[PDB]
Design a protein around this ligand. Structure first.
Ligand SMILES: C[S@@+](CC[C@H](N)C(=O)[O-])C[C@H]1O[C@@H](n2cnc3c(N)ncnc32)[C@H](O)[C@@H]1O
Ligand SMILES: [Mg+2]
Ligand SMILES: [Mg+2]
Lengths: 95, 55, 140, 54, 15, 338
RNA sequence: CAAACCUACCGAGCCUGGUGAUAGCUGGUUGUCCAAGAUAGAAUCUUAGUUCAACUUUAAAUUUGCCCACAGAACCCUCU
RNA sequence: CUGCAUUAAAAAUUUCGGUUGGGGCGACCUCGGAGCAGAACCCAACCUCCGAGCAGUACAUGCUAAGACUUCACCAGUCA
């Protein structure tokens, strides 16, 4: 990770995480499952079913992805008819 | 590690374009199965069109 | 040009001396017509599998003979045990039959003297050998 | 146009879909009976084979 | 046992 | 590749120094056949469309040598195992059988194997309503032929290697219908063969023993799992002592008056004749068992049309490979327990 | 042909520059006082290292935490 | 003479996976079962071995969805 760029002197962003992960404004990160398009013929329907959802990351991975991503991707976006609009805020969360 | 079976593609005859993959024996005629088609919400015939790979 | 690269093939790729090449051209005029690929394979077949050096092949006129016929006679003897490919040291545990009686002589006497087997066995082997070559060529 | 063309393609195929379904099932049954009939002859050909011995 | 030789170093004469 | 002295060449070198004196001038004749592609035989599956397969095979210019053999059985004069159909090409014929295809019954039409492998089955002399034991059954060359006869109410198949016994189950499933194997009529087990001397002593009437040996045809071609590998050099030396025990175990398991066939794919008498002599001597001294070796000259006299035999045998029968008929090498001897 | 010699260290001369080369390796790492504070593992061209985990520290929110009375935790196989 | 191809020649850059006293010759690296590990779980070698790198039968071997378990992390896997 480039902490200070040679042309602007500011932290850069690892584009690898951008192409693979989606971040909600609440701080949660959404990812796919590895191998969900590989060797589908040798996997049971139950295994294939649970392989094609979108799952969240734990605290350490969320901290890992935040450090590799600049503040631009942590802003609040107002996309029109955004499918994940309802998931950007937590409801009835205690502690 | 001889490959005795082959993975083949089954295409619906209803024209919906729905396909699914199943394994078959190399020394066998083309399979014409009866499988559920999610597009038409009913069971229709599927015929074999192409061979995917050999396992 | 086709003469130019042929002698270049013989002198450089086949590593023949100038005098030997002139002897090859004089003794065997038929080397010019066919392509370079099968001549190099014919030469290396004798050099490695038969273990015969340059003065022997330029004296016995080995190149003028058909590639198919030399393959049939040499492989049969090797499988018969009458012919053994020389090792790295160049030592053969059995006396190698002279190149003269393998090829220069007719098959009837060649079978009678060196092979010591019936004619129909050789014909069966010839069909067997031709089958493996076309499978090998198809595979390659 | 393409949505209409696609939809009428299914309607044409689904109109005759039960026709070849029962035809395929009839063919599946008919060869099974033929195989059983061949076995009966095979079981029969053993009978005279035993009969010829005795 | 390669030949290892360290040539002497001379201090400057001004001292 | 391999560093130095490949096991294929090591096997050939050992064969050369051993078979040069063993066979005399016949060694070069069989050396080529061992180095040449073997001629395959097509055993017709009786459970499949045997009449249609036989009709189909005859259109490919193939003759039923077994059917021809039983014709000359009376011409020359315990009979043999009946209702066996195997088709082979003529002497000097090079064509190969097309790959087998399943029939309308769902079972494989026929099987492809070495013709000489069927000879031990014929010399066993199967009878209807018999009991069959098979030591070293996998992969199922003998077992498939035995089940084709259909003269055994119960069959016991044993082999040590689970991997090879696994492929034995595959050929049984593909060829033999499940209802015949559903009951205890066919039994497949994987234990040591030497235990049958105590497991079921004097039980089976017919027993076939095919001891492991340095397969001459396979050793000169395959480069993996070679008996002549220096790691298997220790195992190769102790091959006869396991062979004599395995024959002893089969001779103990068979009932008095039973028929035993000892078969092996090799040409050296060290694993063919001396093992038979060692087993009969061991039983006479240790277990005090008398066993009589039957003469199979009449068995041989019917098969020179399609097979080549070595005419200097002592106790058993040895089949030499030849260019005209590449079947073999196979050795088999028949003895009866008294 | 001694892998000799090429300005008193030539298996590839010397000087300057790239250069504050790199080093999972060695050595070093400067005032006072108090407190908390140790040995499950996994992966790794990895076992002289690193990451996760466990352990440990600080601040904050909350309520149960340790100890443990009966009852309860398999058969072929009694080292019951 | 230039451009594009094919052969050679002479060269350029880079590297030498681990485990088994060393070498030679070989063996092993992934997954599962019993022994150690006797009664929740876990528990190591130079460990003792035995096996596995398939096949069979379906063709709703369809689609959604509470609640849970885990090979001591993650990735992944499992039940419903
Ligand atoms: C020479 S093969 C015979 C193959 C088959 N019976 C045939 O005729 O085609 C013998 C096989 O028996 C197996 N085997 C070796 N020792 C055995 C034993 N002690 N008990 C049972 N099987 C054994 C080996 O794996 C070997 O592949
Ligand atoms: Mg430094
Ligand atoms: Mg303290």
């Amino acid at each position: 990770l480039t902490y200070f760029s040679a042309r602007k002197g500011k932290r850069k962003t690892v584009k690898a995480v951008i192409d693979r992960f989606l971040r909600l404004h609440c701080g949660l990160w959404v990812r796919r499952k590895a191998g969900y398009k590989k060797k589908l013929w040798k996997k049971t329907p139950a295994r294939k079913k649970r392989l094609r959802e979108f799952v969240f990351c734990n605290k350490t991975q969320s901290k890992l992805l935040d450090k590799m991503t600049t503040s631009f991707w942590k802003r609040r976006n107002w996309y029109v008819d955004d499918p994940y609009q309802k998931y950007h805020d937590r409801t009835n969360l205690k502690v | 590690s001889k490959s005795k079976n082959i993975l083949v593609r089954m295409v619906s005859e209803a024209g919906t374009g729905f396909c699914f993959n199943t394994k078959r024996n190399r020394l066998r005629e083309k399979l014409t199965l009866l499988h559920y088609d999610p597009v038409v919400k009913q069971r229709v015939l599927f015929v074999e069109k192409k061979k995917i790979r050999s396992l | 040009q086709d003469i130019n690269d042929t002698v270049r093939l013989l002198k450089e790729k086949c590593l023949f001396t100038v005098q030997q090449v002139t002897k090859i051209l004089h003794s065997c005029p038929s080397v010019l017509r066919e392509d370079l690929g099968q001549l190099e394979y014919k030469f290396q077949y004798a050099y490695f599998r038969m273990g015969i050096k340059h003065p022997d092949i330029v004296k016995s006129e080995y190149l003028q003979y058909s590639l198919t016929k030399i393959k049939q006679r040499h492989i049969y003897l090797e499988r018969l045990g009458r012919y053994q490919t020389p090792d790295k040291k160049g030592q053969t545990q059995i006396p190698n039959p002279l190149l003269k009686d393998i090829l220069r002589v007719s098959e009837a006497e060649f079978l009678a003297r060196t092979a010591c087997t019936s004619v129909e066995e050789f014909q069966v082997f010839k069909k067997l050998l031709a089958r493996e070559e076309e499978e090998s060529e198809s595979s390659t | 146009q393409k949505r209409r063309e696609r939809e009428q393609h299914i309607a044409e195929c689904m109109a005759k879909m039960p026709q070849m379904i029962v035809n395929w099932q009839q063919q599946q049954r008919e060869n099974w009976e033929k195989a059983q009939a061949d076995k009966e002859r095979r079981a029969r050909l053993q009978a005279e084979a035993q009969e010829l011995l005795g | 046992t390669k030949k290892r030789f360290t040539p002497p170093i001379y201090q400057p004469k001004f001292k | 590749t391999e560093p130095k002295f490949p096991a294929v060449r090591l096997a050939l070198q050992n064969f050369d120094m051993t078979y040069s004196v063993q066979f005399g001038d016949l060694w070069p004749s069989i050396r080529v056949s061992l180095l040449s592609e073997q001629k395959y035989g097509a055993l017709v599956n009786n459970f499949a469309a045997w009449d249609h397969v036989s009709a189909k095979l005859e259109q490919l210019s193939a003759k039923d040598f077994v059917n021809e053999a039983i014709s000359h059985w009376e011409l020359q004069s315990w009979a043999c195992s009946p209702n066996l159909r195997c088709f082979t090409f003529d002497r000097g014929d090079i064509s190969r059988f097309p790959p087998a295809r399943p029939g309308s019954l769902g079972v494989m039409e026929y099987y492809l194997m070495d013709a000489a492998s069927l000879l031990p089955v014929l010399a066993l002399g199967l009878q209807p309503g018999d009991i069959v034991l098979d030591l070293c059954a996998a992969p199922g060359g003998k077992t498939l032929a035995l089940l084709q006869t259909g003269c055994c109410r119960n069959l016991a198949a044993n082999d040590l290697s689970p991997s090879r016994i696994a492929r034995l189950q595959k050929i049984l499933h593909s060829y033999v219908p499940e209802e015949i194997r559903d009951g205890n009529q066919v039994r497949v087990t994987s234990w040591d063969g030497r235990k049958w001397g105590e497991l079921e002593g004097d039980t089976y009437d017919r027993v076939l023993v095919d001891v492991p040996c340095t397969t001459d045809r396979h050793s000169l071609h395959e480069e993996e799992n070679n008996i002549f590998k220096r790691s298997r050099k220790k195992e190769r030396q102790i091959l006869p002592v396991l062979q004599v025990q395995l024959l002893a175990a089969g001779l103990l398991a068979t009932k008095p008056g039973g028929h035993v066939v000892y078969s092996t794919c090799s040409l050296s008498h060290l694993q063919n004749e001396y093992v038979v002599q060692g087993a009969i001597e061991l039983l006479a001294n240790q277990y005090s068992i008398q066993v009589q070796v039957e003469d199979l000259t009449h068995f041989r006299r019917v098969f020179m049309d399609t097979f080549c035999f070595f005419s200097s045998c002592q106790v058993g029968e040895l089949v030499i490979p030849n260019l005209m008929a590449n079947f073999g090498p196979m050795y088999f001897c028949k003895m009866r327990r008294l």
